[PDB]
Amino acid sequence: LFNYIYSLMDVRGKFLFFSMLFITSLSSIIISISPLILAKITDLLSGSLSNFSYEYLVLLACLYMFCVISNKASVFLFMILQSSLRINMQKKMSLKYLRELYNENITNLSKNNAGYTTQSLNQASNDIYILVRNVSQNILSPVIQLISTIVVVLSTKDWFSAGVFFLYILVFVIFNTRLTGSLASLRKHSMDITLNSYSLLSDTVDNMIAAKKNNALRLISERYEDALTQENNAQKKYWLLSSKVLLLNSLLAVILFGSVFIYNILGVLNGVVSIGHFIMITSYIILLSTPVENIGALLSEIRQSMSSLAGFIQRHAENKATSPSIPFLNMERKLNLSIRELSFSYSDDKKILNSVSLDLFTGKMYSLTGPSGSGKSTLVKIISGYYKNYFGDIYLNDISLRNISDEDLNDAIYYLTQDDYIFMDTLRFNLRLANYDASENEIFKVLKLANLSVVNNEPVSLDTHLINRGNNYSGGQKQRISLARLFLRKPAIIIIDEATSALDYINESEILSSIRTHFPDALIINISHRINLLECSDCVYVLNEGNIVASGHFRDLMVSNEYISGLASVT
Amino acid sequence: LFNYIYSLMDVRGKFLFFSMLFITSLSSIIISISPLILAKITDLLSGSLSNFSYEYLVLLACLYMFCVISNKASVFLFMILQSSLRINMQKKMSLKYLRELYNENITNLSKNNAGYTTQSLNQASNDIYILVRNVSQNILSPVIQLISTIVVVLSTKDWFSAGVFFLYILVFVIFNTRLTGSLASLRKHSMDITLNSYSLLSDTVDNMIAAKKNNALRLISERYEDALTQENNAQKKYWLLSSKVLLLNSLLAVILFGSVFIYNILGVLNGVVSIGHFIMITSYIILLSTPVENIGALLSEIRQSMSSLAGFIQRHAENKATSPSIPFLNMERKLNLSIRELSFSYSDDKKILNSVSLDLFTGKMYSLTGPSGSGKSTLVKIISGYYKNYFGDIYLNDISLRNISDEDLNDAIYYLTQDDYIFMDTLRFNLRLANYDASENEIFKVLKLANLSVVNNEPVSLDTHLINRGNNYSGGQKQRISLARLFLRKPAIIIIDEATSALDYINESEILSSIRTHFPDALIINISHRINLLECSDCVYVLNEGNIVASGHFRDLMVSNEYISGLASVT
């Protein structure tokens, strides 16, 4: 946990922290002499008061002031160094999640929305900054100011004060650490529900168009008001208990340090305690409020932030990629396919796939028809690397798919959906998304073969913008955007699913053969009921509610079974 | 601006602020007596020192301590009252944007993503809280502590100190207010680029699936690193200048208050100034650092937060809805249609619509065919209430569409798209989105007519969840979800666009006639090239690249023009 925080510090990052560590711990020394200086200032007024006993008052006045100026200017140096550190430990932090999300599975990206992660990352940098505000300052600065006090009073031989001052620190730690336990899980849940409070704003602001079109303003507001009060009442539970802990600790200061002020004020009127000794003991308590309270700031803030930070390490940083079965993917390409007894359970309630023992061999065109999405559209999604809640193993040239990590898996297995994923930027962006190694020459080359170079009988520029959810291009052009990424990249096993729903023959002839042209040694798989696409194939499969039922050519399936016979009569 | 901040305070909200105002302004009084108490403590040590001149030292010691305890415990009461206020001024703030977004146009929702608003609202509650931290505390608390100082020193007749103490406050305001001007627009831009820094994370985390599938990890990281440094360097420009302003103001304290400490320390060694008078003047400067610095906190924090808060009022709170042309919508329904010379300019570069003078009359079925999306799909979107960058007026029973506000406009004009807008919750949620007045009885009633009640020959429960971007249901079922909202609501002018792209005759016969059944007096408009849907119509229109070209029946258009003749030959 600690290493991940210190990892954010680069060259300048590690240089400003040690600067922060010294400067703050230096101010503690100069401020510890401060009560002792005024004691000898006060004592001096009852002295002989000759030539040098009026110049000493002047001297020590500056000596006390300098100590204040030094510790004063030290905090401004502390909040300038940290403000410089705030920038440096944000740059190398923003990507330390971006890249963590990339390598993590879709099963943890489908259940997380845009606004969720906007706050999930917001609380991480919020807690680490607070953890630095405690690791640097509150670790040494109070400790140095507190130890001086214990011995100084023990040295001047005021044993009671030397006891009670130690007893407050003795009690204060036990009281806080025991209570922090729940306060931590309460700030945890408070931030966890605060997380969920904006997990709904994400779904709100995105689909507000429909809400405006259906006018359920109240539902939008009321559903949001429900989570809002779920947060407030969970924040009440924490604030209440946190505030109640204060009145306890602050009462103790009046209990212990109040009685010490009483103790010495009694002994001073007699003659057991001098004016200065009394003045020093009261001024010590006066300057004992600063370390005592900042010791508390350490104990709590560190623990509650560490628990709310722990809910960021045990989910994204492994055990998804341990750098294990990175092998292999053949370099001459061609990897075939072999599935043996595939079974899925989404919500456990039913069996998606029952028994699937199939073997496919690369370099030829295959097809998947029958009862629509009964387990044919999903079968290839588990293969492509969406879910790992399946049974058996999917072998691809001596290697099962459950073994290969998602970084090497997507290099050979490229899958085309109906639901295309387009960004909110230039044409170049989405095209260079398939490859950063492909520059302007091959980019415009893939465009003429992706049937989107010349749109409305006029060539499209590469700086042409695109609006969110594919709001810039039509139903047919949204699918052809998903097609440009295919020719720009180079896979070994290609899968196609009902992406020929928003396309016609004048453009379906120039696309279905170009895949065979560019990728001939590859394993092309298509999932579209069209008879003209089911005929070009070397092998056709029928998938009824999960289990495999038929296989072979189109001319044998339209004679043997009656679905392919009742699909070939609708031409 | 100020009224919108005070509006957040309800009954308990307005009660805790006045509690905050008194308690903080009360601590300023007790702390102003503090330097004067120690002055008479110090002076007393050079006195006659009889019976009552050792009991007075004891008395004033408590009197000084109580003053510290009072001001000390006052800050904990201040940060407990504000922590209570933080909850109360968040509940009535979260919706004070949710509802502001609802009434605002799509043209300001298409250009704003989920993560943008997650931070656009985050900085609003961040600046108001800071503004309360200045309006309550820093308005009175320093002012009371500062005025006492001016007269006390003027009363004790130390005219120089009474001058220089006033001169620092005289200079400090002019220095800060002149420099704040740019610092405000720099924190503005800093927060504006910080806004834009996460405007890309929204597009990143949402479409990470494609990035993982196309492996452009570097591009994702590098594009994010580009905005990250665009932020850091814009944050550098602010921090640098802000930090440079400190070393100036803090030098002035050593320039002015340093020389006053020198002034009196010179006059004390002589006999012009007594021990106590000197001790009080030094202790005043000592306790003058607290109001002076907190006066600065007011001057700046208020101005920079007010400018970064101003960029939240002049965009959402009007001039979209002034409560003007709320009239009318006929109660017996039937409102007809009348467009006169419609023209659009998206990027100005071209003319989307050239000349459109058309009149439609309610109670009958209409159609729009021809060259796909050439201005036929967009024509109805400007009508439905998407854009106001058009020419002319669209009259609907003596009222032009440019006049009716979007709240009354969506009640009669309901439009069905291909791109459906589904949420991330239960079946009930999306269904009750069309109406909150419709309970369980009519909800299940619309389901059997929306062809989604009995899915896979098994009835679907109303607590059935749905995954983001329609990831739970298929291409055909995503369109039929958009259809249930139609029968659940009651419009006067219905528009349909290529939503019959992912549907077949066994379900297209049970839907196309049910709209005529449920809404007969309504103006049904369809935009689908299908000949069977173009025949049922009372009037068909042809739309070529913006301008109107043909109108009339299907049997006259398939004889007169050659497109409808070359569309009716493909059956």
Residue numbers in the entry:
A (entry chain A), B (entry chain A): 9 to 579
What does the paper behind this entry write?
The McjD‐apo structure was also determined by molecular replacement using the McjD‐AMPPNP structure but only after splitting the McjD monomer into two domains, TMD and NBD. Inspection of the NBDs did not reveal any electron density for nucleotides that may have been co‐purified with McjD. A striking difference between McjD‐apo and other apo ABC exporters, such as MsbA (Ward et al, 2007) and PglK (Perez et al, 2015), is that its TMD is in an occluded conformation, similar to the McjD‐AMPPNP structure, whereas the NBDs have disengaged in the absence of nucleotides. This conformation is called here apo inward‐occluded. Inward‐facing ABC exporters display domain intertwining of TMs 1–3 and 6 from one subunit and TMs 4–5 from the opposite subunit, which results in opening of the TMD to the cytoplasmic side of the inner membrane (Ward et al, 2007; Perez et al, 2015). In the inward‐occluded McjD, TMs 3–5 from one subunit have moved towards the equivalent TMs of the opposite subunit, resulting in the loss of intertwining and occlusion of the cytoplasmic opening. The McjD‐apo structure can be superimposed with the McjD‐AMPPNP structure with an rmsd of 2.1 Å over 569 Cα atoms; their TMDs can be superimposed with an rmsd of 0.7 Å over 290 Cα atoms. The NBDs of the McjD‐apo have separated by 7.9 Å (measured between S509 and S509’) relative to the McjD‐AMPPNP structure, a distance much shorter compared to MsbA‐apo with a distance of 35 Å (Ward et al, 2007). The NBDs have moved in a “scissors‐like” motion similar to the transition between inward and outward‐open MsbA. We designed the A122C mutant at the beginning of TM3 on the cytoplasmic side of McjD, with a Cα‐Cα′ distance of 7.3 Å.
